[PDB]
Amino acid sequence: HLDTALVNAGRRKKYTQGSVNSVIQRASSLVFDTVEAKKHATRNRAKGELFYGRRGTLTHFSLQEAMCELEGGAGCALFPCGAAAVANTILAFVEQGDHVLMTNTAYEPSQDFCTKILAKLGVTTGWFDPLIGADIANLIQPNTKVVFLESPGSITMEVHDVPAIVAAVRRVAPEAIIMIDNTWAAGVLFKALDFGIDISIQAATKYLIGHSDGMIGTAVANARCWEQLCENAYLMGQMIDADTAYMTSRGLRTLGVRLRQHHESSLRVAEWLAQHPQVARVNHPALPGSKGHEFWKRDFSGSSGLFSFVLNKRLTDAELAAYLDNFSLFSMAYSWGGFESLILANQPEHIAAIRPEAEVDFSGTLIRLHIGLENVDDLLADLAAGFARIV
Amino acid sequence: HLDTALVNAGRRKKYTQGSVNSVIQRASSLVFDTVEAKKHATRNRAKGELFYGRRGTLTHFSLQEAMCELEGGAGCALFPCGAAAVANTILAFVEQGDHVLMTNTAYEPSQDFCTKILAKLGVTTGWFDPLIGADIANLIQPNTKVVFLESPGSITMEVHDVPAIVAAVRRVAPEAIIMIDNTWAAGVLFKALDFGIDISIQAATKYLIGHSDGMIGTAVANARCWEQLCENAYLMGQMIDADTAYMTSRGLRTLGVRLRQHHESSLRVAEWLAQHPQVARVNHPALPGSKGHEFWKRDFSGSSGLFSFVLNKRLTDAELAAYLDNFSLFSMAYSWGGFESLILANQPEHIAAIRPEAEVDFSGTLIRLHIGLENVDDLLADLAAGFARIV
Amino acid sequence: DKHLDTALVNAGRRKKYTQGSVNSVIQRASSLVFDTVEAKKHATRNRAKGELFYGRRGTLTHFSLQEAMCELEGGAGCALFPCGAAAVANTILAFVEQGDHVLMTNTAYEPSQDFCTKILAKLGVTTGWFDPLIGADIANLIQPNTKVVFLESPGSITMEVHDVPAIVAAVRRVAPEAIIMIDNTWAAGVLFKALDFGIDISIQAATKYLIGHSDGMIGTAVANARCWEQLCENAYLMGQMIDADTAYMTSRGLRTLGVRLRQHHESSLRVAEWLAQHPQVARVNHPALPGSKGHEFWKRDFSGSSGLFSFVLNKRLTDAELAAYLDNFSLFSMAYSWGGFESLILANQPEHIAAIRPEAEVDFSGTLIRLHIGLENVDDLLADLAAGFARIV
Amino acid sequence: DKHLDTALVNAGRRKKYTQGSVNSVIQRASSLVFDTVEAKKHATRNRAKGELFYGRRGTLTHFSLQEAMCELEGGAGCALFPCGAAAVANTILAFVEQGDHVLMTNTAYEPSQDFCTKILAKLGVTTGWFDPLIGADIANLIQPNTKVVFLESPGSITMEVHDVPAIVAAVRRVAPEAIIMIDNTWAAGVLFKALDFGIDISIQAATKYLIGHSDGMIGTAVANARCWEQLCENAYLMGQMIDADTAYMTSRGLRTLGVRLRQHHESSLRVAEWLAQHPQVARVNHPALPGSKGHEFWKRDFSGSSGLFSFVLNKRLTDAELAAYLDNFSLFSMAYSWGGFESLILANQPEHIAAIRPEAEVDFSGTLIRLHIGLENVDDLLADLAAGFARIV
Ligand SMILES: *Cc1c(COP(=O)(O)O)cnc(C)c1O
Ligand SMILES: *Cc1c(COP(=O)(O)O)cnc(C)c1O
Ligand SMILES: *Cc1c(COP(=O)(O)O)cnc(C)c1O
Ligand SMILES: *Cc1c(COP(=O)(O)O)cnc(C)c1O
Ligand SMILES: [Mg+2]
Ligand SMILES: [Mg+2]
Structure with missing residues (x-):
C-alpha cells in the first residue's frame, strides 16, 4: 500500500x-x-x-x-x-x-x-x-x-x-x-x-x-x-x-494524507466553480469534461490540488486588482504544492505566448488556484467574495 | 582592510x-x-x-x-x-x-x-x-x-x-x-x-x-x-x-584568521619538505623556486594551505599503503579548505593523463597536502613518521 | 468538521x-x-x-x-x-x-x-x-x-x-x-x-x-x-x-496537524475496535472507544482523538514471550515517544505500571501494550498485529 | 604556543x-x-x-x-x-x-x-x-x-x-x-x-x-x-x-576556537594598551593588561586571553552623551552577548554596576564601557574608538 x-x-x-x-x-x-x-x-x-x-x-x-x-x-x-x-x-x-x-x-x-x-x-x-x-x-x-x-x-x-x-x-x-x-x-x-x-x-x-x-x-x-x-x-x-x-x-511521510486532502478539497472547489455563473470553464483533471479527464480517471490513482478556471469575461486591469488584491485566505505567489492556498491570473494572450505554434481556445481571464489544507468552506467563501468584487 | x-x-x-x-x-x-x-x-x-x-x-x-x-x-x-x-x-x-x-x-x-x-x-x-x-x-x-x-x-x-x-x-x-x-x-x-x-x-x-x-x-x-x-x-x-x-x-567572517594560519603553517611545512632528503621537489606557490612563484609574490596578498610535493622515488603499491594507511593526523579524502589536514597521492602517469597534450616533468610519486589548523609541529611529526615508513 | x-x-x-x-x-x-x-x-x-x-x-x-x-x-x-x-x-x-x-x-x-x-x-x-x-x-x-x-x-x-x-x-x-x-x-x-x-x-x-x-x-x-x-x-x-x-x-x-490528527483518529479507532473483539485482548484503553475509562468525558469535552492508545493482553508475557512478540514486527517499531508518522509499540508489565501509580494498584493482570498508530495503511498495521498475536498464542 | x-x-x-x-x-x-x-x-x-x-x-x-x-x-x-x-x-x-x-x-x-x-x-x-x-x-x-x-x-x-x-x-x-x-x-x-x-x-x-x-x-x-x-x-x-x-x-x-582566541587576545590587548594611555580613560579592566585587578593571577593561571574587557571613561556620560557616543559607531555594534566575530560595545553606568555588586560599592565614578573585540582589523577599530572619544570630549 x-x-x-x-x-x-x-x-x-x-x-x-x-x-x-x-x-x-x-x-x-x-x-x-x-x-x-x-x-x-x-x-x-x-x-x-x-x-x-x-x-x-x-x-x-x-x-x-x-x-x-x-x-x-x-x-x-x-x-x-x-x-x-x-x-x-x-x-x-x-x-x-x-x-x-x-x-x-x-x-x-x-x-x-x-x-x-x-x-x-x-x-x-x-x-x-x-x-x-x-x-x-x-x-x-x-x-x-x-x-x-x-x-x-x-x-x-x-x-x-x-x-x-x-x-x-x-x-x-x-x-x-x-x-x-x-x-x-x-x-x-x-x-x-x-x-x-x-x-x-x-x-x-x-x-x-x-x-x-x-x-x-x-x-x-x-x-x-x-x-x-x-x-x-x-x-x-x-x-x-x-x-x-x-x-x-x-x-514523503505525510504525502499520502496531504494529497488526499488536496484532492478532496480541490475537486469540491472545481465542482462548485463548474456550476458558477461567472465561470466559463474549469480545467481540473478530476472534473468530468475537462481535457483528458478520461485518461486521468484511467491512468492516475488520485489528484493533487492545482487546477485552473476561465472567467466569463476578460478582466480589465482595474478589475484584476480589485479581484486579486483583496483575498483573505488565498495568497498571490508562484509555486504550489504547499499547505497554503494560492491564486494567480493570466490573460489569454499570456498563455498563447507560451503555447508554441498554437493558439488558445478561450477569451476570459484564466485563474490558477492551488488548493491547500485550509477548510474548504472558508476557501469557497473567499472565492465567492472575489466573484462579488468583479460581478 | x-x-x-x-x-x-x-x-x-x-x-x-x-x-x-x-x-x-x-x-x-x-x-x-x-x-x-x-x-x-x-x-x-x-x-x-x-x-x-x-x-x-x-x-x-x-x-x-x-x-x-x-x-x-x-x-x-x-x-x-x-x-x-x-x-x-x-x-x-x-x-x-x-x-x-x-x-x-x-x-x-x-x-x-x-x-x-x-x-x-x-x-x-x-x-x-x-x-x-x-x-x-x-x-x-x-x-x-x-x-x-x-x-x-x-x-x-x-x-x-x-x-x-x-x-x-x-x-x-x-x-x-x-x-x-x-x-x-x-x-x-x-x-x-x-x-x-x-x-x-x-x-x-x-x-x-x-x-x-x-x-x-x-x-x-x-x-x-x-x-x-x-x-x-x-x-x-x-x-x-x-x-x-x-x-x-x-x-566569510573567519576567512581572514583561517587563511593566515593555513599560510603560516603550510609555508613552514613546505620549507621543511624542501630541505628533506626524501623530497625531490615542493610545489607551493609561496615557496621560492616553485613554478610561477614570482607571480604569486607579485600578484597575491597571501597563500592558502593546499600544496603538493614529489617524493624522491616512485612508491610501489605496498609502499603507498604503508605510507598512506598509517597517518595519525592527516586524513585521506578529496576536497580541502577545512580545518582538518588531508593527504592524497598520485603517480606521475595519473597526472599526465589529466594534462592534455602534455607530459609531466617528474617521476616520483606526488603527494598533495592540505594543511589545516592543527599544531604544525604535530603535523611535521606525522609527516616524519610517514617518511620513516618508506625510507 | x-x-x-x-x-x-x-x-x-x-x-x-x-x-x-x-x-x-x-x-x-x-x-x-x-x-x-x-x-x-x-x-x-x-x-x-x-x-x-x-x-x-x-x-x-x-x-x-x-x-x-x-x-x-x-x-x-x-x-x-x-x-x-x-x-x-x-x-x-x-x-x-x-x-x-x-x-x-x-x-x-x-x-x-x-x-x-x-x-x-x-x-x-x-x-x-x-x-x-x-x-x-x-x-x-x-x-x-x-x-x-x-x-x-x-x-x-x-x-x-x-x-x-x-x-x-x-x-x-x-x-x-x-x-x-x-x-x-x-x-x-x-x-x-x-x-x-x-x-x-x-x-x-x-x-x-x-x-x-x-x-x-x-x-x-x-x-x-x-x-x-x-x-x-x-x-x-x-x-x-x-x-x-x-x-x-x-x-x-502546525500546518499539517489537522490532516494528520484526523488520520491518526480514524486509523487508531479502527485498530481499537478490532482489538476489542479479539480473543487475545482483555481490555482496550482508547478514549474514543465506547466503554473506555472516561470515554463519556472524551465524547463530551474533546473535538477529536489522536492515535496513541493501549490494550491489555489476555496474559502477562514472560521476558521470552515479550521478545518473540516485539522483536518480530514488520511495521511497528519499538521506541519511546509518539506523535509521528510511524507506528510504534511498547510493552509495560502490570507490575511496572503499579510502581508508577502512587498510592494505587492496577486493575489488570496482563501485559499492557501501548500503540502509536501512524500514517501507514491500517490494513497493513492490522496484519502486523495479527502476526504478533500468532507468535504468542 | x-x-x-x-x-x-x-x-x-x-x-x-x-x-x-x-x-x-x-x-x-x-x-x-x-x-x-x-x-x-x-x-x-x-x-x-x-x-x-x-x-x-x-x-x-x-x-x-x-x-x-x-x-x-x-x-x-x-x-x-x-x-x-x-x-x-x-x-x-x-x-x-x-x-x-x-x-x-x-x-x-x-x-x-x-x-x-x-x-x-x-x-x-x-x-x-x-x-x-x-x-x-x-x-x-x-x-x-x-x-x-x-x-x-x-x-x-x-x-x-x-x-x-x-x-x-x-x-x-x-x-x-x-x-x-x-x-x-x-x-x-x-x-x-x-x-x-x-x-x-x-x-x-x-x-x-x-x-x-x-x-x-x-x-x-x-x-x-x-x-x-x-x-x-x-x-x-x-x-x-x-x-x-x-x-x-x-x-x-571548537575547530576554529584556537585561531579565533589568539586573534581576540592580540587585538584586544592592543586596544587595551592604547586605552590605558588615553587622556579620556580613567581605568582599563583587561586581565592580560598589567595593573588590572587580578592580572598576576591571570598571568600565572591562564594560558591566554579572550577579547572581552572593559574600561572606565574619565566622566559619567549623561543619557544625551551616551547616545552621541554609542549611536554613531561605524564598526562596533550595540548588543548583549559576545564571543563572536563582530566587535560589540555596551555601557553600564557606575550606579548600575553597584546595584549588581551585592554588599559592595564600586570604586569608580565614570561610565564603564564593555568592549568585545572581534576579528576586524584592529587599526579600524581604534579609529572607531577614537571617533567616539571625539564625540564626548
Ligand atoms: C514548479 C515547476 C517546475 C520547476 O521547479 P522549481 O523547483 O521551481 O525549479 C518544474 N515543473 C513544473 C511542472 C513546475 O510546476
Ligand atoms: C573542489 C574543486 C572544485 C569543485 O568544487 P565542488 O564544490 O567539489 O564541486 C572546483 N575547482 C577547484 C579548483 C577545486 O579544487
Ligand atoms: C513525551 C511526554 C512528555 C515529555 O516530553 P519530552 O519532549 O520527551 O521531554 C510530557 N508529557 C507527556 C504526556 C509525554 O508523553
Ligand atoms: C552570556 C553569559 C551567560 C549566559 O549565557 P546565555 O547562553 O546567554 O544564557 C553566562 N555566564 C556568563 C559569564 C555570560 O557572559
Ligand atoms: Mg502560441
Ligand atoms: Mg597528457
Whole structure:
C-alpha cells in the first residue's frame, strides 16, 4: 500500500543509525581509512558508497533509495530545483543534431531552456498538442532523440493519453528517450515508468517538500537510461544539499494524507466553480469534461490540488486588482504544492505566448488556484467574495 | 582592510532584521500583496526584490552582496557546488562553433565537462601550458570565445602570469570572456577582476565554507558579463539552498584568521619538505623556486594551505599503503579548505593523463597536502613518521 | 468538521515574521543589535513583549510560534522549553515555594512524577496524588497549602480521561487561587481546549504531534492572563528557551496537524475496535472507544482523538514471550515517544505500571501494550498485529 | 604556543559519530528505535552512558560534543543545556536542598545572582557574597550549611580575576565536601583548566566563544567524577538538553576556537594598551593588561586571553552623551552577548554596576564601557574608538 511505502521508503538502519529518520550527514570530504577503502569507494562512487559529497552522503542515498522504490526506477538523480532537473535531464541525452519533441503545454522555463539554451547548441525542438495521442508518430523525425511529456500540462491542465503516445513513439523510434515532468502527480499518483516512460522528473519543491520552504529536483530513470543520466548530470555538477534531501524524505511521510486532502478539497472547489455563473470553464483533471479527464480517471490513482478556471469575461486591469488584491485566505505567489492556498491570473494572450505554434481556445481571464489544507468552506467563501468584487 | 570587510560584507539591516547574521529565509513561493507589488517584483527579479525562490531569498541576496563587495564584481551567481559553477559559467557563454582555451592544469572535472559535455554540443577546447604568459596570443583562434585560467593549477600548483595572459588575450580578442577558477585564493587572496578577468569562479565548498560540511559554487562577474551569466545560469536552474548560503556568509567572517594560519603553517611545512632528503621537489606557490612563484609574490596578498610535493622515488603499491594507511593526523579524502589536514597521492602517469597534450616533468610519486589548523609541529611529526615508513 | 484547519494554516504568520515567504524566517541569534540607545531602552522595557532584545527571550522565529500557540490554545502567553519534560518541571517550579503542596493525578507521565518526588521534595514542596476519575471528590484532598493541581487527560499509558469540569469546579470551590495545570500533549493542545475549561496553564510536549515527525524536541506552556507573568519570568530565571530552528519546525508542524490528527483518529479507532473483539485482548484503553475509562468525558469535552492508545493482553508475557512478540514486527517499531508518522509499540508489565501509580494498584493482570498508530495503511498495521498475536498464542 | 590546536580539531570525532564525514552526523530524534527487547534492556541500563535510548538523553551528535568537552576540560561528564543561564541555574539547583547555603562571588553574571535571590531563596536556600579578591579569607565566610561555592573569573563586566588556588585551598580546609563551581565562559573553558585547579564543575555559556558566531545558544557543565552522577541525573529531571543541530554547531565552533582566541587576545590587548594611555580613560579592566585587578593571577593561571574587557571613561556620560557616543559607531555594534566575530560595545553606568555588586560599592565614578573585540582589523577599530572619544570630549 502506498501509505505504508511512503512511511518506510529509504529508511534502512545504515542511514537512520537508530533514529526514525535518516541522519543528516553534511560533507564534501569523505574519509578513506586505507588505500583499499578508497579504491572500493571509487568503484562504487555512484552505487551508494561514501566517496565525495558531490555524489552524496548517507542522507542523499536514503532519499535516492526512497524515490527509486516509490517511482519504480533504477536510479534517482538529484538537482538544486525542478527547473535544474528538467534542463539537465534533457541535456544529458542530447548532442548537436538531435531533435526534442515537447508538449506545447510544458512548463514555461522548460520551453525557455529548449529555445534559449538547446537551440544555440545545435539541438532543435518541435512541439505537439497535448491531446495528440497516437498521431504523435507523424511528428517523429529521423533525428528525434527525446520526447518530453507533461501531464497534466502546466496552467491549463490538459492530460495526455500516455499509453497512446508511448505506443506510437515505440513503433517509430523504439530507442527514443521518453521523459515526463510528473510534478503534479508528485511522482506517485501516476506511475510513469510503469507506462513505458524512461525518466520521471519532478520539482520536489512542490508536493514532496509540501511546505513551500525547500527547493529540489529529482529524476528517476529506468535501467536503460540511468547510467547516462547519472554521469552526465554529475558532469554538470548537479546535486542537492544534505539538509534539503532530508526535508524531502521527511515530506514523503505525510504525502499520502496531504494529497488526499488536496484532492478532496480541490475537486469540491472545481465542482462548485463548474456550476458558477461567472465561470466559463474549469480545467481540473478530476472534473468530468475537462481535457483528458478520461485518461486521468484511467491512468492516475488520485489528484493533487492545482487546477485552473476561465472567467466569463476578460478582466480589465482595474478589475484584476480589485479581484486579486483583496483575498483573505488565498495568497498571490508562484509555486504550489504547499499547505497554503494560492491564486494567480493570466490573460489569454499570456498563455498563447507560451503555447508554441498554437493558439488558445478561450477569451476570459484564466485563474490558477492551488488548493491547500485550509477548510474548504472558508476557501469557497473567499472565492465567492472575489466573484462579488468583479460581478 | 580585508578583515573588517570580511566581518561586515553583506550584513545590512534589510537582511539581518536585528541579528548579527542574515536571517535564513526558506522559500519557493514568495508572496505578493498586490498586483502592483507583483509587477515591481517581476521587474526586479534579478535585482534583489523577492520574486521566486529560484532567484533567491533575503539570505541569498545577502551572500551575493557580500561576494560582489569582496571580489569587486557587478553580480554573483550561486550554484550547487564548485563543479556546477564552472560547468554552467562556461556553458553560459558558448554556443555551437565556439572555442574554449583552457589551462592544462585545470581541475579534472572542469576538463571533463569540456571534453565530455561541450564537445558533443559543438564547442571545441584547446589547451595551454600554465606558464605560457604572453605567448597565449598565438593560440587564440577566430572562434575563441572563452579563455579559462586556474591559478594556482590543480594538484601541481603552477601559478599563471595573469597580467601577461590578459594583455595578450585583449590584444587579439578584446571581447573574449576571460574566466578564472579562483578557489585556492578563496577569491580574496587574488583580486581577479582587478586584473581584467571577467568572471571569478569559486568552489565555496572549500575555504569559504571552511569546515568540510557544505557544498556551493559562486561566480562573480563584471558589469559587461553579468546579465548573460545571471540569465543563462538561471535557465539551467542553478541556485543554492538558503541554509548553505547562510553558512557561506558565516564562513566569510573567519576567512581572514583561517587563511593566515593555513599560510603560516603550510609555508613552514613546505620549507621543511624542501630541505628533506626524501623530497625531490615542493610545489607551493609561496615557496621560492616553485613554478610561477614570482607571480604569486607579485600578484597575491597571501597563500592558502593546499600544496603538493614529489617524493624522491616512485612508491610501489605496498609502499603507498604503508605510507598512506598509517597517518595519525592527516586524513585521506578529496576536497580541502577545512580545518582538518588531508593527504592524497598520485603517480606521475595519473597526472599526465589529466594534462592534455602534455607530459609531466617528474617521476616520483606526488603527494598533495592540505594543511589545516592543527599544531604544525604535530603535523611535521606525522609527516616524519610517514617518511620513516618508506625510507 | 475541519473547523481548525484554516487557523492551523495561518496561525502566527504575520508579515513582520514571514518577510515575504510563506513561513516565518529563521532568525538565529544570541546578540540582537540596537541601532540606538533609544531603541535599546524600548527593547528593554518590552523585552518580554515581543521586541527584539536578546536571544534568550527569543527572535522573530520564536515570537511567531508563541503567537500561533496563544491563538490556537486561547492563552495570554506561551513559554518555550527544550522539551516537554522541561516544560512540566519548570512550569510547576515557577509556581511553588517552600511549604507548598502539589496535587497531581496518579496517571501523570512518570518523569513528571519523578520531578515532584526527587526534586520538589528536597526543596520543601510536598506532593499528593489522586485517582484520575476522582471528579468532584478532589475537593477533599485540597489542603490549605495546595498551590498546584496537576491534571493529565488522557492519562499516560493507561489513557484514563478526567472529568475536567467536575475537577475544576471543585478546586474553584475550595481553593479558587490554586494554579490548575494540565499536560495536554495527547490532544496536541487543540483537541481539548483546556483554557476554556478554567484550567490556568496547558503544557505540551510539542515533541509529539506538533513536530509530528519524531525529529525535534520542544516543550510549550500556554497560560491565561492571571498566570502568564509569573510563568514567563520564573521560567526565564531558569534559562528556559528553545532554539530558533526547532521553533520554526514546530510552527511548520502546525500546518499539517489537522490532516494528520484526523488520520491518526480514524486509523487508531479502527485498530481499537478490532482489538476489542479479539480473543487475545482483555481490555482496550482508547478514549474514543465506547466503554473506555472516561470515554463519556472524551465524547463530551474533546473535538477529536489522536492515535496513541493501549490494550491489555489476555496474559502477562514472560521476558521470552515479550521478545518473540516485539522483536518480530514488520511495521511497528519499538521506541519511546509518539506523535509521528510511524507506528510504534511498547510493552509495560502490570507490575511496572503499579510502581508508577502512587498510592494505587492496577486493575489488570496482563501485559499492557501501548500503540502509536501512524500514517501507514491500517490494513497493513492490522496484519502486523495479527502476526504478533500468532507468535504468542 | 598553539598547544591545543590539534586537540580542538580532533576532539569528539570518532568514527561511530562521524560515519565517514569529517564532522559528526546530525541525528535529529526524540524516538530512538530498539531492534530487540535485548537492545532496549542494554540501552536502558546505559541510558546515561552513551547508548542510544531517548532523544532527551541525546543522540550521536550530543555524544560527540560531550566527548569533546570532557576531553578539552578534563572532566568525567558534560551536561548540556538550552543556554548558559540554564546551565548556571540548573547546575546550582542540582546540588542544593532546603536549608543549604550558596557562597557566590559578587561579580557573578547578573542572571546567576537573580536565580539565587529570586528562585533559590523561596525554596529555602540562602545565598551569601564575597569580593572576587578575597582569596584565602573566603574561609571565614563558609557556614556549616554552605554546599556550593560559586566562582566566576574574570568577573562579569568588571573583569576581576580570582586567586583560584587560594580560594580552593581555603574551601578544602574548612568544607572539603563543598561543591566548587566556576562560570568559565570568558576562558571558553580552555584558557583556564578549572578542573585541574580542584574546582568540581566548570560551566560555560557555549553561546559565546564556542559557537563563535553570535547565532546559537547553549550551555555546558563539565563535572569531575565525584559530582557527575548528581549533575547528570538532577539536570535530566529538569528536562535539560540542547537540540542536536546546536550541539553540532558547538562541536564545529571548537575547530576554529584556537585561531579565533589568539586573534581576540592580540587585538584586544592592543586596544587595551592604547586605552590605558588615553587622556579620556580613567581605568582599563583587561586581565592580560598589567595593573588590572587580578592580572598576576591571570598571568600565572591562564594560558591566554579572550577579547572581552572593559574600561572606565574619565566622566559619567549623561543619557544625551551616551547616545552621541554609542549611536554613531561605524564598526562596533550595540548588543548583549559576545564571543563572536563582530566587535560589540555596551555601557553600564557606575550606579548600575553597584546595584549588581551585592554588599559592595564600586570604586569608580565614570561610565564603564564593555568592549568585545572581534576579528576586524584592529587599526579600524581604534579609529572607531577614537571617533567616539571625539564625540564626548
Ligand atoms: C514548479 C515547476 C517546475 C520547476 O521547479 P522549481 O523547483 O521551481 O525549479 C518544474 N515543473 C513544473 C511542472 C513546475 O510546476
Ligand atoms: C573542489 C574543486 C572544485 C569543485 O568544487 P565542488 O564544490 O567539489 O564541486 C572546483 N575547482 C577547484 C579548483 C577545486 O579544487
Ligand atoms: C513525551 C511526554 C512528555 C515529555 O516530553 P519530552 O519532549 O520527551 O521531554 C510530557 N508529557 C507527556 C504526556 C509525554 O508523553
Ligand atoms: C552570556 C553569559 C551567560 C549566559 O549565557 P546565555 O547562553 O546567554 O544564557 C553566562 N555566564 C556568563 C559569564 C555570560 O557572559
Ligand atoms: Mg502560441
Ligand atoms: Mg597528457
